Amino acid sequence: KVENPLLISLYSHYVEQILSETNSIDDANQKLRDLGKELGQQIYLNTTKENVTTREEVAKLIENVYKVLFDKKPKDVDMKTARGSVRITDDNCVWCQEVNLEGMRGFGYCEIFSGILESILEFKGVDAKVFQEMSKATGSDVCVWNVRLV
Amino acid sequence: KVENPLLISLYSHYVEQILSETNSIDDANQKLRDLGKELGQQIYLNTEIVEKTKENVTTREEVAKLIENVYKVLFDKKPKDVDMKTARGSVRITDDNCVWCQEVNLEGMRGFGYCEIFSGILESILEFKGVDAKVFQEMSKATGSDVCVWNVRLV
Ligand SMILES: [Zn+2]
Ligand SMILES: [Zn+2]
Numbered sequence: 418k419v420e421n422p423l424l425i426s427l428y429s430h431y432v433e434q435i436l437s438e439t440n441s442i443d444d445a446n447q448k449l450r451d452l453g454k455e456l457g458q459q460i461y462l463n464t465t466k467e468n469v470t471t472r473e474e475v476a477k478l479i480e481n482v483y484k485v486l487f488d489k490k491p492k493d494v495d496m497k498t499a500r501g502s503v504r505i506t507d508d509n510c511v512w513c514q515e516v517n518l519e520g521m522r523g524f525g526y527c528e529i530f531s532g533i534l535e536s537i538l539e540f541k542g543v544d545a546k547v548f549q550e551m552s553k554a555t556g557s558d559v560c561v562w563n564v565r566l567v
Numbered sequence: 568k569v570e571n572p573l574l575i576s577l578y579s580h581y582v583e584q585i586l587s588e589t590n591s592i593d594d595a596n597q598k599l600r601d602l603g604k605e606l607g608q609q610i611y612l613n614t615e616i617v618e619k620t621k622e623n624v625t626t627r628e629e630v631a632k633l634i635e636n637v638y639k640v641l642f643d644k645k646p647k648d649v650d651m652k653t654a655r656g657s658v659r660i661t662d663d664n665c666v667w668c669q670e671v672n673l674e675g676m677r678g679f680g681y682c683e684i685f686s687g688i689l690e691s692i693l694e695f696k697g698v699d700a701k702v703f704q705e706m707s708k709a710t711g712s713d714v715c716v717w718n719v720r721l722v
Binding site: 431460 | 569571572573574575576577578579580581602605606609610613614615641666670
């Protein structure tokens with residue numbers, strides 16, 4: 418049923434602490450992003466000829482990174498809706514399984530992945546900004562992260 | 568292949584900051600046990616455990632069976648050794664492939680229980696099933712030993 422109970426419980430603890438420490442939902446989001454960026458290096462180590470540049474190559478690399486971290490492909494990788502960005506959709510996000518928060522729309526419970534993906538892309542020569550577009554933890558049907566190529 | 572890289576990296580961040588802040592070394596172990604007890608409190612309710620064990624545990628055989636079932640639920644394997652020390656009223660848990668300290672190599676930190684979070688988790692779970700215990704880590708591959716070992720003191 419629930420995949421990686423240990424990871425989701427430890428991350429729940431991290432989210433609880435950040436929420437208790439910050440003074441706004443915006444800053445909580447940014448702190449979770451920063452956490453993910455800090456972890457990206459170690460995650461990259463524990464897991465060809467020229468840096469990729471096209472959005473199709475970026476989307477393929479995103480699919481490969483998602484397979485490597487989560488043993489599966491993303492529900493959707495979309496290069497059409499937003500333009501200049503790639504939207505990653507997952508209907509069974511590992512981070513927010515069974516998490517139901519009320520009155521917290523706009524809080525990206527799963528922004529750690531924004532940071533992880535931003536750091537991994539940076540290591541591969543892809544400069545980007547990533548934020549969580551929506552989270553099932555706050556009522557959405559899926560989780561969506563927005564990767565903007567800068 | 569490092570198992571569970573996300574969990575390991577997040578726990579590596581937590582121990583790093585919990586080695587930058589705390590006073591001594593033993594209170595760092597207590598902070599890690601406390602973290603583990605919170606995680607175990609949360610863990611008994613999203614249930615891969617409730618289906619795979621009994622609600623009420625008392626006897627020594629029940630305790631050993633509970634430790635093995637909890638290990639197989641949380642880590643998808645049973646530990647290398649579960650040794651019941653009846654004359655000491657304890658249980659020694661040995662694991663040669665602990666998930667927490669994979670590829671961790673800390674210099675001159677013997678006595679630091681890098682993997683005490685499991686002490687907290689197990690203490691909370693045993694407690695939830697009616698077993699008053701005190702769990703602490705005796706050795707950790709992260710600090711130079713060949714195995715990780717935890718001690719369940721039964722009270
Ligand atoms: Zn999510
Ligand atoms: Zn260990």
